[PDB]
Amino acid sequence: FRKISRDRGIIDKIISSMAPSIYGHRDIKTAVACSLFGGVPKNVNGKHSIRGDINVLLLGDPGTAKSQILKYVEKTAHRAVFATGQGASAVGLTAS
Amino acid sequence: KIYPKLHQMDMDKVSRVYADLRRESISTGSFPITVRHLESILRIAESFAKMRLSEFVSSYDLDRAIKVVVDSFVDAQKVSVRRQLRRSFAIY
Amino acid sequence: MQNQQEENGSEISIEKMKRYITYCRLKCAPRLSPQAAEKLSSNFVTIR
Amino acid sequence: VCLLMGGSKKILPDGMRLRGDINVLLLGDPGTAKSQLLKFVEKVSPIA
Numbered sequence A: 001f002r003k004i005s006r007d008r009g010i011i012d013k014i015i016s017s018m019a020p021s022i023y024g025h026r027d028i029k030t031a032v033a034c035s036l037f038g039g040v041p042k043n044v045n046g047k048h049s050i051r052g053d054i055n056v057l058l059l060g061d062p063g064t065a066k067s068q069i070l071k072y073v074e075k076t077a078h079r080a081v082f083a084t085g086q087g088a089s090a091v092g093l094t095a096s
Numbered sequence B: 001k002i003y004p005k006l007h008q009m010d011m012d013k014v015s016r017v018y019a020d021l022r023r024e025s026i027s028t029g030s031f032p033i034t035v036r037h038l039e040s041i042l043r044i045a046e047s048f049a050k051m052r053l054s055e056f057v058s059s060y061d062l063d064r065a066i067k068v069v070v071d072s073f074v075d076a077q078k079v080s081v082r083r084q085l086r087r088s089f090a091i092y
Numbered sequence C: 001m002q003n004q005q006e007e008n009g010s011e012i013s014i015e016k017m018k019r020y021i022t023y024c025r026l027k028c029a030p031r032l033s034p035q036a037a038e039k040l041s042s043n044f045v046t047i048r
Numbered sequence D: 001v002c003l004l005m006g007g008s009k010k011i012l013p014d015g016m017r018l019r020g021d022i023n024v025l026l027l028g029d030p031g032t033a034k035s036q037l038l039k040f041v042e043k044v045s046p047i048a
Ligand SMILES: Nc1ncnc2c1ncn2[C@@H]1O[C@H](COP(=O)(O)OP(=O)(O)OP(=O)(O)O)[C@@H](O)[C@H]1O
Pocket: A021, A022, A023, A024, A060, A061, A062, A063, A064, A065, A066, A067, A068
C-alpha cells in the first residue's frame, strides 16, 4: 500500500481502475472515485456537524450505461445496498 | 486510518476564488452560488488528499477538486449562460 | 476559540444551557408593569 | 433566545385560555444557514 502511494499520479490510476468495462465518461468515473473514498465528518464541540460523504446524481438519456456503473459500485464496496424506485426489489426505502 | 488535515497556510487562494465565482454568478443571471459550493470544494479536496494516504491537504488536491465543482456548475446551465461562463472561468 | 473563551465566562456550554432553560421555564412567570402597558398600547395604534 | 423561554400562560375564569408561546418564520433565499439554526434549536431544547 505505502509503496503504491508514493508513485506520483495514483489519482489517475484509480480513476481508470473504476467501472473497467464502460467506454469513456471520465467525469463520472472521477465522481465515482471521489464518492467511493469519502472525507472526514466533523463535530465542533458537540454543537455543529458537517457531513463527510459526497452525493452523486446521474442524469442521462436512455442507453448510456448508468445501471452498469451502479452494478460496479456494489461489487467494489464494503457496505452497499440496492433499491429500486419503480420495480421489484428485495428492500424498500421506508421503515416499517 | 486516513484522516487528512487542513493546515490554513492555504486559505488565501480559496477566499479569492469564491469571491470571483460569486461576483460572476450574479452578473450572468443564473443559479446562485452559496457556501455549500465551497464546503463541497473542501470536502472533495479531503478525498483527493486521502487518495495519496497523505498527511496535509496539498494545493494540487485543491486545484484538482476545483475543476469538478466549476465544471458541474458550468455544464448544468442554459446554452447562452453556458457560453458566457465557459469563457469567464477559463483559468480554473 | 470556543473551548478556550468557554473557560473565561464569555460562553455557556450545550448541557448547561439546556438545564438553565429548563430551570427558568419551570421556575417563574413574568406579569408586566402597569407603568409600561400604555406604552405598548400607544405603539400599537401608531403602528396601525 | 426569547423563543425558547415562551410567554406566560394565563388561564382565565371565563373558561377562555390565553396561550403563551412564540412563533417565528424564516423566509428567504437558499443557502442562508437558516436550516442549521433549526438543527441546533433541536439539540439546545429539552423537548424537541
Ligand atoms: N458508453 C457505453 N459504453 C459501453 N456500453 C454502453 C454504453 N452506453 C450504453 N452501453 C450499453 O448499452 C446497454 C444500455 O443498458 P443500460 O440499462 O445500462 O442503460 P441505461 O441508460 O441505464 O438505461 P435506461 O436509461 O434506458 O433505463 C448496456 O448493454 C450497456 O452496457
